[PDB]
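the nine lines:
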Amino acid sequence: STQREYVFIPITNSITIDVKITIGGSDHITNIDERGIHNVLVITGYAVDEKNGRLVPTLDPCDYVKGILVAGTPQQAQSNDFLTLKLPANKLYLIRKKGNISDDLKIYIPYSSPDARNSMKTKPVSISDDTIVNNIIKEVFDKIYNITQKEKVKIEKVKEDIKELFSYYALEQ
Amino acid sequence: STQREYVFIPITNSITIDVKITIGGSDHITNIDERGIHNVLVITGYAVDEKNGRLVPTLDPCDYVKGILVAGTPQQAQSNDFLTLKLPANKLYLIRKKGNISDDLKIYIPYSSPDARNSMKTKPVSISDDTIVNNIIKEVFDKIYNITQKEKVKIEKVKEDIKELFSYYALEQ
Amino acid sequence: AIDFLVNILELIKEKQCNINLFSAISLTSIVYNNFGEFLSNNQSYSTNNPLLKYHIIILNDKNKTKDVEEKRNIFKREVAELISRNFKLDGEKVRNYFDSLKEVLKSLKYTIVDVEITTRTRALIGVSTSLGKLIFGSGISFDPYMNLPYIPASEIKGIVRSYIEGKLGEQEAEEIFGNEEREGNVNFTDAYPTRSKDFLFVPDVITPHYNGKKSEADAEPRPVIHLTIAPKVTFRFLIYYKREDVGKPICDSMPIILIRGLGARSSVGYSLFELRKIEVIKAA
Amino acid sequence: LYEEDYKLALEAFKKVFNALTHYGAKQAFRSRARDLVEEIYNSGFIPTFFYIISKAELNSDSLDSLISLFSSDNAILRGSDENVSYSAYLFIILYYLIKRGIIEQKFLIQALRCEKTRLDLIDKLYNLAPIISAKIRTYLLAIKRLSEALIEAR
Amino acid sequence: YEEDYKLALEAFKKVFNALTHYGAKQAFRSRARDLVEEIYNSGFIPTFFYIISKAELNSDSLDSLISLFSSDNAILRGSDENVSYSAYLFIILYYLIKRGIIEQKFLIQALRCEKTRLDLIDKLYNLAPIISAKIRTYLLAIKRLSEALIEAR
Amino acid sequence: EELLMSLKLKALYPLTGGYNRHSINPFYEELVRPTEIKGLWRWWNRVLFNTLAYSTKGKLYTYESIDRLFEDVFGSENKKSAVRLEVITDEGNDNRFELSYVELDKVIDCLRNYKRKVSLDFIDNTLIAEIEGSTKIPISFKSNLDIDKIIKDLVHNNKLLSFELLGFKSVEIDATKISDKKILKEILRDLITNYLEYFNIKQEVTFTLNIYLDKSREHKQNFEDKLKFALYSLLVFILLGGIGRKTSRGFGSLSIIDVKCYDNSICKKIEDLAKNFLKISSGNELKSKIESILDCIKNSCIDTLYIENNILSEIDPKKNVVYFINSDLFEVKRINDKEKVLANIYKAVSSEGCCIKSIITDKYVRKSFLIAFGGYRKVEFIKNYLCETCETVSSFNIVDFLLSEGSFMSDYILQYEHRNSLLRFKLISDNSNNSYLIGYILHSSYFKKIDIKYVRCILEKLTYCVI
Amino acid sequence: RIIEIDSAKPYVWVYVTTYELLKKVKLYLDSISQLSNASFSNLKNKIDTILAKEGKNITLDSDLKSAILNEDFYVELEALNNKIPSIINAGVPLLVLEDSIGREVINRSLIRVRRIRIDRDKKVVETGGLWSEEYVPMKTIFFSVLLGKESKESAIFASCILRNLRYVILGGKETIGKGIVELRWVKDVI
Amino acid sequence: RIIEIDSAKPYVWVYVTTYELLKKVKLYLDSISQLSNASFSNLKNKIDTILAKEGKNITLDSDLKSAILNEDFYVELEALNNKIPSIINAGVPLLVLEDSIGREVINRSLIRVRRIRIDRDKKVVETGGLWSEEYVPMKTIFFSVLLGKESKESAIFASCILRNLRYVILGGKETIGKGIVELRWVKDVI
RNA sequence: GUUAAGUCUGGUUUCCCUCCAGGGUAUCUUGA
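prediction for all of em together
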């Protein structure tokens, strides 16, 4: 198996320096094949903190976060605040699976302590207002992938899919 | 609206000098979709002078000019006196339409004064002899374009479109 | 024959799960719509038929019409209560049907998701359906051969797909449930009631005063006695498919949509369910 | 002479359409045409027939008007905008039962206006259930097309 | 003679112009693709009722037809299917006029009355066996024309 | 979809009703119907809107036009409701009405061959089947319904509760012709069941209303302002009305216990205005608390930018009647004893009420005031006080009511059974036995012009006098 | 679906057939016993046992003297002697109506389910998004024949495939739980 | 299909023919009566008795006096001169209509059927695979003649082969069970 | 303070089909 890092994608951007391996190993499992994002992953029951992006366990089953499952290992200044799992690739909850998976993984989710000092009131946070999606490609796909503007002319496709595929629930607190 | 320098596709090697801005802005109109060259423009009633190709206008519907409508400026230097227009981008007869119509275009065209020296009789030029075709790819499709001969595992499959999509007319003087 | 007609209400209250409720109500409606006729001419009413009660009860002596028009509403409410208390649920045939069908589908190499759901609030399904429409004006989605109300498979699938496409995008939704140019990957069956607490059908009312009214000057209550489905009635239905992928979004969506509505009038909290149980039988 | 289902539908709908002076009555009649044809299948001709007779809320000036509509060319259905629509659909069905000769006219106008005959009318209907139910749904489909063509929505 | 294959071109040109929104074109294509078989199997009066029931005749959209008759810049107005059925109604009525089956004056003074419209329908009912045979090749021509000149939605 | 807010309310002697038009029936128990809550919310919204759009425009709109306006949040035949109600009651489980044994043979056996009226009457937790035929048999029943003596004498002392009890307590039986001991058992059982189920009057019913918002219509045209006005109206409904029947006579009066919310951007102001009513301590601060919201809705930070929308439609005062709040015909009081107050309001709303004979002190005038203020009133002169423009003594002139010439208000005011009362009472309390009565009068549109000072005098006199 | 008074066992629905349907079955069986070496002298016997009673509504597997089928048709039946073997091999009666009645009783015995199509943003019904569909009830029985011409693949088919075949999906609407069907061979379980 | 009116004898379908077909059969029977030593006086006399009544719709077997065929066409029959025996023998009435009406009645009797072709893997229609298709109903009767010239093999044919021909398969669509048909020789069936 | 009586209302309105497939492949002089 190989290590895998889960880059959450809310509207915020707190993902710059977190991983030891940015472009990954040979390839990520998430793809960009002119049909938008592929193999994007969903995580249910957790919410992300818009500041210090971290998946927090909030037992409500309506709460979900979609992100990118990349190749890498988080910078080794970490592993005290993350979750780490080996999953057989059938437990994954993917979206637009455009390939095959190693059938046993090593996933790295940015975890958080549930903050039992204030309650956890979540709120659905969609994605719109292009000025917020203009830089998603400039932050989490030109570093995560190299295909950005070497053969990509269909940027509008991944733009619209980011604008519609990725939604999530955030604690907003 | 936005600027458009329509190049002519000759058998000659002079098309490098019509513009220094060979890219334009953020978009190339005539695409490379692995199914061929899309968003191609052809205009009727015209021709191409064999010397320094410029569209000598005639009254012949059967005549046409098969070329590439590049998104952007004619470097503000060339086509400052030639046939230029602004169209609602629908009357722009695009063949093999595979994109968004920008809803308006300001197009620049290689135009030649009606060449009043002789009675201009047409001569059909049918591109073959792939040396011209192994030439045009390096002359522009890497200098004008930016998405070919870099990732292209298929170099000659996109090169063979020219065979059956651009067979213009000439006058051979 | 009219003999079958006059003797229908005792049939209702003395068969109670073995009379065809569809036909029973459809025939009761002929009595209901011809009340002042069945109440005349020294009818062949026995001393136990539920109709000679209105020969005794006198709601208005000044008018012969108003007496009948009041007895008719009394009788409508009485029929609602009759259906409600007599026609109860025997869910052995439904258990047999679902277990046999589950074996059938195991014999077809499907992955099955048996889903039991329980009614919390008085539910309505198929209000524009025809069962009591000739009496109450408001029906219930009924199956005249299983003789039980049900939740159409199309309705459950449509609700689930609306959710999935609300949260996963209308493109992953089409990948799961297909589009006009591809087939769906998930199949649903109707939900039949397997076990109730005490009742299956329960009466209710809806009295619009100011619906489509201009002013307080034409407001007037118009009560609508109809039939609903009792609370604590349990429905089960299967969800089968071949590629186990489509089993992931059916896992999570199902316990989330049932707590919202699943039938009609849910914006006033009526068709509310709860996932009593779920179970997958993988067959890859 | 024998007029087919569509000719009979034209001849009936012409009498009806010219008797509903109020336009709301027309649109309500249209909404009855569009759904009673399916209600009759789902429940039966006899239950739905008497349901129509009840929703018509007859036994008023709303009955001699109906019996004059059979030959007046001036008879005007009156009543609530929901009663006239059902009374018009009742005239539709009675027009069929009479023109097809399935049931006598005078017997129908007698079984409508008082009670002792309504029960033997129930019996008669149960006798002629296959004679009627065989072909009335095509006539009512014709009426549905005529209605949702010649009338605008509400 | 084959002048029906020419009357078909006239009426199809008029429609094709009047369906200013391409969805109406792509829909009228399917209407022409279906209703000819329907007239063959079920007959003319059933299919004519099924057409007038979905055309949604009204003084507004029926004027968009009486104008389309004589004028050349009319535009059929309504929903996509709502006008894909009125275009086909126009096809039919155009044939019935240019073949003198019914008089154009008797039709125009019936497409407006809101009263003699039923009388138009009855007059049509009297001629159903004749029309059912006369219009066959005309409608087959219209079907072919629509399949060719219009691309599938 | 998500929660918008979640209130925790409390009814008070509510008289809700199902198909049974009772709070309980053989099948279930329903103290609070969410459909009634939604309908009363819509009603109060259409009242608050004609209050606002009249104080700031002089204009009044038809109910259907206001509904076409708020269709974005309350739904219609063309759009699903954007808000989803959810009423949750503590102990909201199976509590059907089970009548076990009633033992009514004797009353049957000497009811035969005699068309005889039959009544019922609780006499000290024993009901007496008072035949009209000079016979009274004590019935010995037993049910799961435990009717406390307090509820019995509440129904008995209140002259309104004991009035609507006429429709349930009696049945006439024609046993002259042959009749059975089996059908009559059932007739009497039905009568007993009705009369019994009438007495399911729990005091202080406590539930928990929730609101859900779909998160699909957000800021389409004016959605947020519409939703905020709707929530304002919900608060106004909780503060000015109740649920159930006879709400214009105190019953069902709602009181706030705790208001929480989960989307501050839309609800913070409403939650604050509500929390204001978790601490009421004086009868003279409740008036100011009422007026704060009543006049802020019209003249606060965010009030209206959508009255200019062309969906609305003015009214036809000769054919349209529309209510709205006066915000000045209000008198709050203090009671500390709610049962006797509820029993008292009859004395202040009847034509022969001791509390009216001593405030209007005149026949032909009490009648007219109650007709105009007080809903429907049976009658078989007075119109000289309600005529539109006529010799004026007490200014109860009605916009169109002519002096004996055929019109619309010539009968709507006189012959129309379903007419709400403009004179509305309420018993609002705040979690400390604070227990303040509110009495107000909705301003209707069919009034020419009312002597607000004289009517206020009458109002406060009735409000002190009812206590 | 049936309503009757004066029947010991209560039935919510009854199997129904007519005489022309049995004549079609007899035609099929009589025609394939000539075009092949396979006669079915048992179905033919039962079906002619029935058909001898043509011209009168009868009953096979119970004792109903009258009923109301599909809440519109009052029929008066006559029982057939219990010497008749089991055809459906179930516990439900089987009425055989005269064809001019069974025609109506059957064509009004299918379920019509009115469906809709919901608008997304309004959450209300789309316009023109309403239609009906006829399904055929559960446990309906259709008779058919699977003929095969001489070959060796035909033998392997009729001995290997036609045996391990029992359940198929017919029709459309496969994704709303419709279309499941069991094939019972007369040769195997008559 | 028939919907009888003013006839107490309920039939659900009759046999319909026209005079323009009986006349062609009369042609076939006049000709080969001269080109052979085998005259067919019985059938010829039947057909002559029928064709004597041209210009009127007539019913041979039953007494209907009126009917409605294929749920569109109202015809007024007339019994045939005191019960002229039937040509075919099936107990179902046979109606001989005027030619104008029979044209469209017969057109209505034909069975038009849309079929589709479905992509194997995707369970969705193959673009291009939709077509209509027309059959002639079952229980239809055609008339033909098999003629032979003098030889020994002809005698062996007419005495050994034609006597064992009952069921053949005509036409196409043999996999949809279309085309199974039954030859019934006139010499012995009449 | 007492007597008696309840009365009125009892489902309406929209949507009734939309889109694709409309045939494909094979067979086409002999005597005078």
